């Protein structure tokens, strides 16, 4: 991925997370748990559904056309009819090949981006109370119970509440 | 002690390989197929009006081959021409056969209106044992084989004005006798002329006498021609022999009708897209079933499969 | 107290909706239209040399229809053929009419050089009341209707070598009399032959006698043919009747000339791109005005609008 | 956007900024103000103008072609002429649709990127003297008058001048 | 004191300019050309079986022009037709010449099987001084010029059934005498008829008498026609004069064979892609050498160069 | 570049680095040196080779087609044969132009991304022991000899070994 998160500084995915595409795993004093992040999951799904919406169920109507199979040798005109159809099929086959390759590259990059976005969002939320371990995990330098973890996942974490405790543990 | 908060993403045990700009094989959590590669094996009779030609080609249904009498005045969105179809009337050919078949198929109708031509002085309704209808010698239902009367073939000069608001399609022909004996026997003179004209067009045909290989014991041949008469114009037929006369005109329309060669059976189902292999679903944008299609169809491509990634890269364990 | 430094971007109160790979409706600060959907309603007479055919088709200007005498020896980049144009001379047709019209339009010139053919023994300059020029019976200006002299039509066998450095285009014809009486009246024998050949080509036509619906009281018809003579080759005309002779040759060139059917008026303006609707600007890469174009034109597409984003996403308030 | 700045951690755009695409808003002891960043604005405009330069005013010249309207029924040859033109128009309509969708997606991402670039550039400039509040705003932990703000916008801010003051305010 | 650790990337002193979506000129460390713009100037004789026509067109090798006797029964993947080629036998033309040349080139073989036709009552093996073979007057090797015997041309009515498992291609012709004197001299009657038919097709030709410009002192002309006979069908020839008879049939096949006009010499090398300029390598996806290609070839494009970046942006010093 | 590293916060490339595409330059107590990073170099090369693999040596076989040069004027049918070929060539010329422009834009962005990835990877490795100077260089606040520099380049740098020394030098 072009952002370096998925298959990057995040070592691997979680087969155990089945209610979301992105999420949090925590270990604190009350145990260890898992929770999916709905907003980032929805953001990736909406973009992929936007791709599907303009590729699926959008066929054009064609009716009377040219003949494309021939039982007799005819020469010039039949050569042109065959050449016209072979030309068209090759150009559409090229369109289809390029389309899928471009879309898949973009899909991998956009899902990698959503993972990086959630990581950056969480990092800025923690301010001076945590340090990036480099593998997608934050070392939080204060007691952070389940309500505290839930406040980070909900976006309501107030870093000033724990700042004095965290700075003391960080900078010994 | 503190806490650890880890950010991550899901993964699946059954990933799917897709292609990208940089990699021909990369595994994502899920994908969807963009190439339809199967048909249900039958042509659904909805929503397009299907006409199964059975043993009849469209041209044979047009001329009035005896096995095609049930097709008189029928209409269609798609005429399905079977590969088993065969002719069983007087031996004939059509110069530019493909164009007549195309324009009739595109018109989508075999509506025929009889007209009373003044064939004064000749014998009408010639028949042949090569064209049996009801155990008797007969002929193309829409054509009139004119021959001599009392060993006289007086020159024909007949008009038929188009006072309608639509175009008329006239089907007529020229008989090529196998021998000069047959030419005398049928038309009472050594050589015929046929001139079919309007204010916009003229067609002149001379018969070509000679032996052709026999079909149903007939060494002669008929050549089929057509003429379109615009409203306010007039059809003028001027002949001194060998004329295979029309019995009227076909309505010629414009629309979405066409013809398809197929051996697939007709089924009672609904499908927008028809191929000679049968109907195919049209949810996917591409297909590799058949380059011949009718209706709202995916575009034909050479690839048998194209997987569109619908999930992130799969990174298990 | 410190300070706060905020990073940001602009926004506008009047955004524009565009499409992306992931969203069919997303608002950006600004966009530009890539599909030209309008014309000024007139064909600008610069920079292409326009020739307004008015009441004359290109073929009628070629043959010399009386209302087309002002078009003699004219040249054009684009010949504009009006839908009101009508023929007003002897009734004629052109087998492969579309090809003759195409090759003359592509040549871009009606320059005609008279040549003195040796029509020994026949009457020249036949006329008809169906082709009035100056209140008198006349004929196509570039064609020579040959008939009998003293009830004799001696066989014609005339050559015209091409000693020029360019190709010659010869326009000639065959007269189809309405009756055998007319055939005798005009050519003093029952059937004509016409053979027009060079060292590279041969064309042989037999007249077809028969009544056609009358146009300006004429039941006969002329069929128009053409022959190209390369430098160093020779035109050979060999006929025993019914020959509509050429009076010379047209120069045939290669270049950027063409023909367009249009009813739009000609205006005094400048525009590189011409459509039958009129001239269109060519700043945009695509257009949905008309699939028929001439000049430096945007490409025709089915879409009526395609907005190219020229600014960031608009996120107001 | 794939970088998460525009319509991302930056809540909304500034309708009040009319002399640039990107810029700075500050509040200090001398008041609050606004200033556009010319270099990032120019970078985004140059790329969009590069797109326009190869799409606008680049039409090809065509002259004599095939007929495309017909008054009479002809059959085989007319079928082919119509099929050739319909094939061409569909392929060019596809080209135009895909082109605009790809370009617009890239334009949104490149303008999002330029916003992220300016944010990262400013962040690194401030070193240990400021903290990212997470909404595109920096809390600067020292007195920073108009000349001090102007030095940040000009790229001449010397973090060592204020480091002792900032570290003292940051780590109480 | 500490340490400084700097992250960076390489650069080169000789960068390459490429185009992007946003910039027409941007320098990268390296690029590769995607448009092949050169040929080696010769057509490699591997891996495609090349047949150098030398002085012979394919049609002249088909009919049996004397300078083309070495081409009898030859086969080819690609027939190379030289622009210097010229005919040197009886003057002829082929209606739809391009189609006969195309179907024979696509068939890829000149295998010819002699058949014994029963030309009872006529003189065979007519020759002409316009077609010299071995210092003697001769004729097309695959054609049989039939003329009168004892001033009698009895009507011909000959059959040749196709009892093989493949299609037969028959080449025959019609002689157009220059004068009515020649018509009597050769065929002992004033007008000929020719009817060539099978159970599926019929072809009827009437000779057209008239003077054509002389080629090798011959004012007459032959017109070449062809007929394909399916297995189980029969060829029927029915003529009363002017028949240029076939001596047998050509095998007609389906495959990858074709024909190309070129003056490039044949070389002893290997190359999948052939152009009239010579063979070109096919490693690149596009080429601007020639729109005419044969084999595994890059696609023709208008651009003379397209540089694909293969390295990062070059930022020196 | 869309990530802002190459031709961005990295001022220029190193003509003196000839064994890799990305790498490290250091100055410490034992001198100053250079070393290429193999993994990031390989990552960029593999992606470019993936592009080349589907563009080079992948031509289709065509045999008997239509005629494309004509010595005589013929009219309607020749007009169509010429129009069919001109239509095909224009569409393939468009395909080739768009392909190269898209690929080159992506190649520049992916090489810029790999540079940014290596920078971010090194930054997270140093934890609180170094500061980003903003030009792709890290100021390391402890004695870091050649073995110490080599541990950073190898990914085995243990930040806890030097943390006390670094924090003392950083926060005076
Ligand atoms: C007073 C007097 O002397 N008057 C003269 C007349 O007698 C004379 O008429 C001719 O007389 C001879 C007598 O020997 C003969 O009967 C002529 O009739 C033809 O005969 C041949 C030989 O049998 C026959 O050929 C056979 O045809 C069949 C097929 O037959 C049909 C069919 O297709 O079913 C019969 C149809 O009625 C007929 N259609 C029409 C509209 O008449 C067609 C048609 O003739 C063919 O399809 C055209 O090819 O044929 C089969 O093909 C056998 O293989 C074949 O041998 C002809 O069919 C008979 N012709 C007719 C019209 O019936 C008879 O004309 C007159 C002229 O000679 O002169 C007077 O003075
Ligand atoms: C000594 C002796 O006896 N000599 C004999 C000759 O007399 C004889 O000549 C024929 O004589 C009869 C006498 O009754 C008659 O006049 C023949 O002339 C034709 O007459 C018909 C009947 O009127 C006429 O048909 C009418 O044609 C007009 C249109 O007229 C023009 C036109 O288009 O304007 C007149 C043009 O001059 C003419 N063009 C040329 C080059 O001659 C054309 C052309 O004939 C037609 O366009 C061809 O279709 O016609 C209108 O169409 C009316 O509706 C129609 O009734 C013919 O036009 C007259 N033909 C000519 C050539 O003038 C006259 O030939 C001779 C042969 O019978 O035998 C001698 O022994
Ligand atoms: C007992 C009695 O009286 N019987 C009568 C016969 O005599 C008579 O036959 C005709 O007799 C006259 C006598 O003056 C004459 O010889 C006729 O022969 C033609 O003569 C002309 C004039 O020279 C000649 O034209 C020249 O042709 C050459 C080319 O010659 C060849 C060639 O192409 O090499 C010769 C070939 O053999 C011939 N091919 C075949 C299959 O016969 C071809 C062919 O004829 C042409 O290619 C067709 O265009 O020609 C050159 O072109 C000169 O420029 C040209 O002047 C003809 O070629 C001679 N024709 C033949 C067949 O040889 C002779 O027929 C008979 C009929 O009048 O009536 C009896 O009662
Ligand atoms: C130019 O040359 C062609 C070719 O020779 C001639 O055309 C042939 O004409 C003859 C008649 O003259 C045709 O012969 C007929 O064939 C029919 C089909 O024969 C097949 O089928 C039967 C069984 O149905 C088999 O027994 C036979 O072996 C074949 O396999 C037969 O049904 C006909 O028989 C009937 O008529 C004859 C004749 O009166 C009676 O004796 C019989 O008892 C029976 O009633 C007949 O044999 C032949 O088919 C034609 N061939 C082709 C290819 O068309 C042309 O006539 C000639 N042109 C001129 C002007 O002469
Ligand atoms: C094969 O059959 C066709 C069709 O019947 C014949 O062609 C017709 O020929 C007749 C003459 O024989 C033509 O009749 C002429 O029609 C002209 C146009 O008529 C219309 O316009 C007039 C007013 O201008 C109306 O009054 C009329 O009702 C029509 O609406 C008339 O102008 C002609 O009149 C002049 O000539 C006659 C005859 O001499 C004089 O009596 C008059 O006073 C006047 O001077 C004339 O009536 C008819 O138009 C032809 N029809 C077509 C479709 O072409 C062929 O002749 C026939 N072939 C053979 C070989 O016989
Ligand atoms: C319809 O009209 C055409 C055109 O006039 C006639 O066709 C011409 O027919 C004559 C014969 O009647 C042909 O004349 C022959 O030309 C040959 C080529 O001449 C060129 O080359 C020679 C040298 O080889 C030069 O001297 C000459 O100037 C030319 O440049 C000559 O080789 C022939 O000469 C031989 O025959 C004559 C006649 O017997 C002898 O006197 C000589 O000694 C010599 O043996 C001859 O001159 C002419 O080429 C034809 N032209 C075309 C264009 O085909 C048709 O005949 C006419 N139709 C009818 C039915 O009459
Ligand atoms: C089109 O129809 C017209 C009229 O029906 C045909 O004209 C007619 O042609 C016949 C000949 O086929 C003429 O009969 C002749 O009678 C005279 C009597 O003197 C005689 O000399 C001839 O031997 C022949 O028997 C008839 O008079 C004539 N009618 C008219 C009004 O001219 C015409 O032939 C038809 N054209 C075609 C191509 O069929
Ligand atoms: C091409 O032109 C040539 C020459 O001009 C034509 O040849 C000529 O044809 C006529 C017949 O149409 C011949 O006249 C005949 O005269 C004899 C006298 O004995 C007589 O028996 C016939 O009834 C007829 O009147 C003439 O002699 C002849 N000339 C030559 C030199 O052969 C030829 O017919 C033209 N071809 C075409 C297709 O127009
Ligand atoms: C196809 O071949 C057949 C048979 O070979 C041809 O039929 C034959 O045609 C000739 C006329 O060209 C007939 O000869 C005639 O003989 C009578 C004797 O009474 C006489 O009146 C005539 O003047 C002529 O000499 C011959 O009888 C006839 N044979 C049969 C069996 O009918 C036919 O002409 C050929 N068709 C073509 C287009 O070549
Ligand atoms: C994979 O994607 C397709 C297309 O959106 C969807 O129908 C299918 O349910 C997806 N599979 C899973 C397991 O979500
Ligand atoms: C459809 O029919 C064509 C023509 O017979 C055949 O080549 C193709 O394999 C068929 N495809 C399927 C999916 O049946
Ligand atoms: C241009 O003319 C065509 C043909 O009449 C018509 O269909 C189309 O709507 C016209 N477009 C404009 C913009 O006038
Ligand atoms: C190939 O031949 C064509 C036709 O003569 C010519 O236009 C073109 O310039 C040639 N190209 C090369 C590379 O020789």
Short mmCIF file of N, CA, C and O in Angstrom, two decimals, chain B residues 89-122:
data_model
loop_
_atom_site.label_atom_id
_atom_site.label_comp_id
_atom_site.label_asym_id
_atom_site.label_seq_id
_atom_site.Cartn_x
_atom_site.Cartn_y
_atom_site.Cartn_z
N UNK B 89 -39.37 -25.20 -51.49
CA UNK B 89 -40.25 -24.69 -52.53
C UNK B 89 -39.47 -24.63 -53.84
O UNK B 89 -38.55 -25.42 -54.06
N UNK B 90 -39.84 -23.71 -54.73
CA UNK B 90 -39.10 -23.57 -55.98
C UNK B 90 -37.68 -23.09 -55.70
O UNK B 90 -37.48 -22.22 -54.85
N UNK B 91 -36.68 -23.65 -56.38
CA UNK B 91 -35.30 -23.21 -56.15
C UNK B 91 -35.11 -21.75 -56.53
O UNK B 91 -35.53 -21.31 -57.61
N UNK B 92 -34.48 -20.99 -55.64
CA UNK B 92 -34.33 -19.55 -55.83
C UNK B 92 -33.02 -19.09 -55.23
O UNK B 92 -32.39 -19.78 -54.43
N UNK B 93 -32.61 -17.88 -55.61
CA UNK B 93 -31.56 -17.16 -54.91
C UNK B 93 -31.98 -15.70 -54.78
O UNK B 93 -32.91 -15.24 -55.45
N UNK B 94 -31.29 -14.99 -53.90
CA UNK B 94 -31.51 -13.56 -53.73
C UNK B 94 -30.18 -12.84 -53.90
O UNK B 94 -29.30 -12.96 -53.04
N UNK B 95 -29.98 -12.12 -55.00
CA UNK B 95 -28.82 -11.21 -55.08
C UNK B 95 -28.86 -10.23 -53.92
O UNK B 95 -29.87 -9.57 -53.68
N UNK B 96 -27.75 -10.17 -53.18
CA UNK B 96 -27.69 -9.43 -51.91
C UNK B 96 -28.70 -10.00 -50.91
O UNK B 96 -29.46 -9.26 -50.27
N UNK B 97 -28.70 -11.33 -50.78
CA UNK B 97 -29.55 -12.01 -49.82
C UNK B 97 -29.40 -11.42 -48.42
O UNK B 97 -30.39 -11.24 -47.70
N UNK B 98 -28.16 -11.13 -48.01
CA UNK B 98 -27.93 -10.64 -46.65
C UNK B 98 -28.63 -9.32 -46.40
O UNK B 98 -29.09 -9.06 -45.28
N UNK B 99 -28.74 -8.46 -47.42
CA UNK B 99 -29.36 -7.16 -47.22
C UNK B 99 -30.87 -7.27 -47.09
O UNK B 99 -31.48 -6.57 -46.27
N UNK B 100 -31.50 -8.13 -47.89
CA UNK B 100 -32.94 -8.32 -47.76
C UNK B 100 -33.28 -8.93 -46.40
O UNK B 100 -34.22 -8.49 -45.73
N UNK B 101 -32.53 -9.94 -45.99
CA UNK B 101 -32.72 -10.53 -44.67
C UNK B 101 -32.53 -9.49 -43.57
O UNK B 101 -33.28 -9.47 -42.58
N UNK B 102 -31.56 -8.59 -43.74
CA UNK B 102 -31.29 -7.58 -42.72
C UNK B 102 -32.42 -6.56 -42.63
O UNK B 102 -32.87 -6.22 -41.53
N UNK B 103 -32.89 -6.06 -43.78
CA UNK B 103 -33.89 -5.00 -43.73
C UNK B 103 -35.25 -5.53 -43.27
O UNK B 103 -36.00 -4.80 -42.63
N UNK B 104 -35.57 -6.79 -43.59
CA UNK B 104 -36.82 -7.36 -43.10
C UNK B 104 -36.72 -7.64 -41.60
O UNK B 104 -37.65 -7.36 -40.84
N UNK B 105 -35.59 -8.21 -41.16
CA UNK B 105 -35.40 -8.46 -39.74
C UNK B 105 -35.45 -7.16 -38.94
O UNK B 105 -36.07 -7.11 -37.87
N UNK B 106 -34.82 -6.11 -39.44
CA UNK B 106 -34.85 -4.82 -38.76
C UNK B 106 -36.25 -4.22 -38.77
O UNK B 106 -36.62 -3.49 -37.83
N UNK B 107 -37.04 -4.50 -39.80
CA UNK B 107 -38.40 -3.98 -39.85
C UNK B 107 -39.29 -4.65 -38.81
O UNK B 107 -40.15 -4.00 -38.21
N UNK B 108 -39.10 -5.95 -38.59
CA UNK B 108 -39.79 -6.64 -37.52
C UNK B 108 -41.21 -7.07 -37.80
O UNK B 108 -41.96 -7.32 -36.85
N UNK B 109 -41.60 -7.18 -39.06
CA UNK B 109 -42.98 -7.53 -39.35
C UNK B 109 -43.08 -8.18 -40.72
O UNK B 109 -42.34 -7.85 -41.64
N UNK B 110 -44.02 -9.12 -40.83
CA UNK B 110 -44.36 -9.73 -42.11
C UNK B 110 -45.78 -9.39 -42.53
O UNK B 110 -46.38 -10.13 -43.31
N UNK B 111 -46.34 -8.29 -42.02
CA UNK B 111 -47.65 -7.85 -42.47
C UNK B 111 -47.66 -7.65 -43.97
O UNK B 111 -46.79 -6.98 -44.53
N UNK B 112 -48.64 -8.25 -44.63
CA UNK B 112 -48.75 -8.26 -46.08
C UNK B 112 -50.17 -7.85 -46.46
O UNK B 112 -51.14 -8.40 -45.93
N UNK B 113 -50.28 -6.89 -47.37
CA UNK B 113 -51.56 -6.42 -47.87
C UNK B 113 -51.68 -6.80 -49.34
O UNK B 113 -50.85 -6.40 -50.16
N UNK B 114 -52.72 -7.58 -49.67
CA UNK B 114 -52.94 -7.97 -51.06
C UNK B 114 -53.34 -6.77 -51.90
O UNK B 114 -54.05 -5.87 -51.43
N UNK B 115 -52.88 -6.75 -53.15
CA UNK B 115 -53.28 -5.74 -54.11
C UNK B 115 -53.68 -6.42 -55.41
O UNK B 115 -53.11 -7.45 -55.78
N UNK B 116 -54.66 -5.84 -56.09
CA UNK B 116 -55.18 -6.40 -57.33
C UNK B 116 -54.44 -5.78 -58.51
O UNK B 116 -54.75 -4.66 -58.93
N UNK B 117 -53.45 -6.49 -59.03
CA UNK B 117 -52.77 -6.07 -60.24
C UNK B 117 -53.56 -6.51 -61.46
O UNK B 117 -54.25 -7.54 -61.45
N UNK B 118 -53.46 -5.72 -62.54
CA UNK B 118 -54.18 -6.01 -63.78
C UNK B 118 -53.26 -6.79 -64.71
O UNK B 118 -52.65 -6.25 -65.64
N UNK B 119 -53.16 -8.10 -64.46
CA UNK B 119 -52.36 -8.99 -65.29
C UNK B 119 -53.18 -9.45 -66.50
O UNK B 119 -53.47 -10.63 -66.69
N UNK B 120 -53.55 -8.48 -67.33
CA UNK B 120 -54.43 -8.74 -68.46
C UNK B 120 -53.69 -9.52 -69.53
O UNK B 120 -52.63 -9.10 -70.00
N UNK B 121 -54.25 -10.67 -69.92
CA UNK B 121 -53.77 -11.43 -71.05
C UNK B 121 -52.85 -12.59 -70.72
O UNK B 121 -52.40 -13.28 -71.65
N UNK B 122 -52.55 -12.84 -69.45
CA UNK B 122 -51.63 -13.90 -69.07
C UNK B 122 -52.31 -14.85 -68.10
O UNK B 122 -53.34 -14.54 -67.50
#
